[PDB]
Amino acid sequence: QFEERHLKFLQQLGKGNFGSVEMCRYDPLQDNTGEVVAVKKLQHSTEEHLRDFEREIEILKSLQHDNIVKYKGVCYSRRNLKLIMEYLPYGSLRDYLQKHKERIDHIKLLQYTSQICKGMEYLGTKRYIHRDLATRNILVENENRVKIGDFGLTKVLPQDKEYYKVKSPIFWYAPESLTESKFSVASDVWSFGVVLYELFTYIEKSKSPPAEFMRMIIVTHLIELLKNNGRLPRPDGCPDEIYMIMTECWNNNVNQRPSFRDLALRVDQIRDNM
């Protein structure tokens, strides 16, 4: 339990469609000497958004893993519920890699890739489908650790099904998520391939998945493009096996995409060889 009176707004960290993350000092002693935390809150007073936010909070609370942002608790002002989590001083991987592209080499990129795989494999064991796997949702803990930092779109698989139908980051979506709104471990694997692309292009704005797909061309055009095996290009200086991994994640057939256990095995091998 966290007291609103002891939660001191420090700075804006990020913003989404219906939420925002802030850096706060949590100090019961009242002299700004306590612990710095990250706080997620909703933008406005809504019921459909609030119901989704409560489900998201219970999803995060249920997760305990080295590569998943740590849940700390909740803060009530009932409405207006706030999610308290650990603050990761280096911020998003999307921004971090854009800022330090000169200093980060392929071994480091493969270290981050492996950790994303491990975090994803753990989601799988819980039957959770992330649905929003992108570098913007990965946070940097330190130079040797990244964590999946947001679960706003995360769904729980039905007990008897390998997919969840929910009626959007379209440039990261698998074809069946675009055509049939079907989300699975396999569509999270497709999105992982897009993350691998993002990392090996060092977040070059002109080479981003929206930039590239729009040049190759909206949901209707993207469906046709993917059906005709239009794909993101090979990033400049890409190691051969990393491009083959991307290609395999992007198979139109759900059943021919690799597993997260196997991606972790393959990425660790490519990294060890270099």
Ligand SMILES: Cn1cc(-c2cn3nccc3c(-c3cnn(C4(CC#N)CN(CC(F)(F)F)C4)c3)n2)cn1
């Ligand atoms: C120096 N520095 C540190 C940070 C920092 C630290 N932390 N520690 C926890 C979370 C963050 C974040 C952060 C930024 N964006 N995000 C999100 C995407 C994701 N992970 C979640 N948000 C979703 C919505 F709540 F806004 F809806 C966007 C999170 N930024 C920014 N600059």
